[PDB]
Structures are given as C-alpha cells and as structure tokens.
Design a protein around this ligand. Sequence first.
Ligand SMILES: CCCc1ccc(S(=O)(=O)Nc2cccc(-n3ncc(C(=O)O)c3C3CC3)c2)cc1
Length: 288
Amino acid sequence: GRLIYTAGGYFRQSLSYLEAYNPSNGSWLRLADLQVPRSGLAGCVVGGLLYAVGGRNNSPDGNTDSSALDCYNPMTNQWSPCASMSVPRNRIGVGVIDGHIYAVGGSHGCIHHSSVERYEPERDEWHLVAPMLTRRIGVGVAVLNRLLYAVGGFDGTNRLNSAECYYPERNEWRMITPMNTIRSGAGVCVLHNCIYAAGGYDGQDQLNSVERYDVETETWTFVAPMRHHRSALGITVHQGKIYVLGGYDGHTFLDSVECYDPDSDTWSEVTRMTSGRSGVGVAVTMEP
Ligand SMILES: CCCc1ccc(S(=O)(=O)Nc2cccc(-n3ncc(C(=O)O)c3C3CC3)c2)cc1
C-alpha cells in the first residue's frame, strides 16, 4: 500500500481517531472517526479495505467490550459495520491468511479467551476454529508462510513468554519455542522470515527490548532495542521496515513513532502522532 493507518486508542478514555501517516512526505491525515470509540482493538487489511476488530469502549458512560468488526474504505472515507464476532474481544490479536481474518484471544470482562475465530469477507460470516492451548489477552499475532502465530499475553493470572502456532489444514495449535522475555501487550509483526516481538509488559516494567523468532532455526534472538520503553503499542511493516506507534512507557502515553531498519539494526524516530495514546490498531493500505 502507501499509508500507515492508526485507528482508535486510549488517552484518558477510548478514542475514535482514524489517522493516516505517509512515510514518503511525513504528513498526517485525520480521517473519518470510528463509529464507536475503542481501545485494545486490532487492525488489518484485506483487499485494500481496512478492518478494525474487537477492543473496548472505556467511557464515562461505562465500559463495554467489543465484538465488533468494522470496515473502512479509503476510496469513500466511510466505515461500514460487518458481522460481529461470537464474543467480545478486548486486547485482541488478529492475523490475515488467504483473505480471511483470524481473531485471537482477548478478554470479555474477567473472561480471558483462548478461543479463535475466522472471518470470511466474501460471506460476511465468522466461524470458530480450534482454540489456542493458552488463554491470551494482549496477545501478539502474526502470519508467516500462511501459519498463524500467537505470542505472549496474559492468561488471567500470569504474563507469558510462551508462543504457539496454528496450522490451518490440521486445525491445530502447537507450542513453539518460548521467548527469552515475558511480554504482554507487545507489538508483534513479521519481517522477512522472522516474527518480531517488540516491547510489552513483563509484570514489572514496560519493555524497550525487541526479539525475533526464526521459523527455520526455531530460535529467538534479541536485536537492537527501541529508544523508548513502551507497552500496548501499535506495530506494522512498511517498505521492509518496522514502525511502532505510541504506547505507554510508565509515565506518558507516547506520541512517538519509531522505525526499525533491519539492515543497520537501528531504530530511529520518524514522526509524532497528533497526540499520545496507547492500544491503537494499525495497518497499511492505499491513500484515500
Ligand atoms: C496507567 C494505564 C496503563 C494503560 C496501558 C494501556 C491501556 S490500553 O487501553 O492500550 N489497553 C491495552 C491494549 C493492549 C494490550 C493491553 N494489555 N493486555 C495485557 C496487558 C498486561 O499488562 O498484561 C496489557 C497492558 C500492558 C498493556 C492493554 C490502558 C491503560
């Protein structure tokens, strides 16, 4: 695509902002708000359409977990509702495989989901698949070689360094090598042949460390850390570079945006969001 879209988030309350960043010229764009404010959501893209999944509206009028799926069309600058998931999923992970959207984990009140479900846009229908082996909220999710990985999170009692992989043709979950660090609410994405896990919360401190899982060697390896410790961040990939947006560093809701270049193994600050916020959903698609 061309732009990095950030949707929703949290600062004092849940937010409805949809803002698009252009790495080519540095410009931010404010776009049509979400119909319902929501933090802890996840974003993804299918067929050029942006999708916001799950989350939670923390508002003075109350707190409502979201089972909602909403579709933004850059061509029209409009949000359309889609079929809702089987359950509310706050602090959700999502991954796209073969044009289908996998919703992973999340919480519904004090319920910490291990359930997983799949959305087929061509039929506007969700269907439950095999549940993970672990309850995970604040779970990182990524797709590599058409395999779905759930990384870290919180299972209702402990933050996790564990990770697992879902094989669709077998409808099966299997544990993989655990991370060297406990991370909940981390940013997880894919670059080349590696699953990157960045930041998060280990139970005591917000993390700036970053590690990556090589699916061939089945090993986790730390890389250069981010400039800012940060949890509940948005993460995406643009032109073979990782972008991490916002988060919470234990003192401030960050408007910082960092960019990781894997050839030099260096992070650099590339811009600031229009305001500090955590728990955004992030994806990449064409300009509107
Ligand atoms: C002082 C207030 C701190 C705060 C931070 C984030 C959010 S938020 O609105 O961005 N919510 C959200 C989003 C994505 C993940 C998570 N998440 N999930 C599990 C855990 C954990 O700590 O174990 C976390 C926590 C570590 C992030 C939560 C609201 C408030």
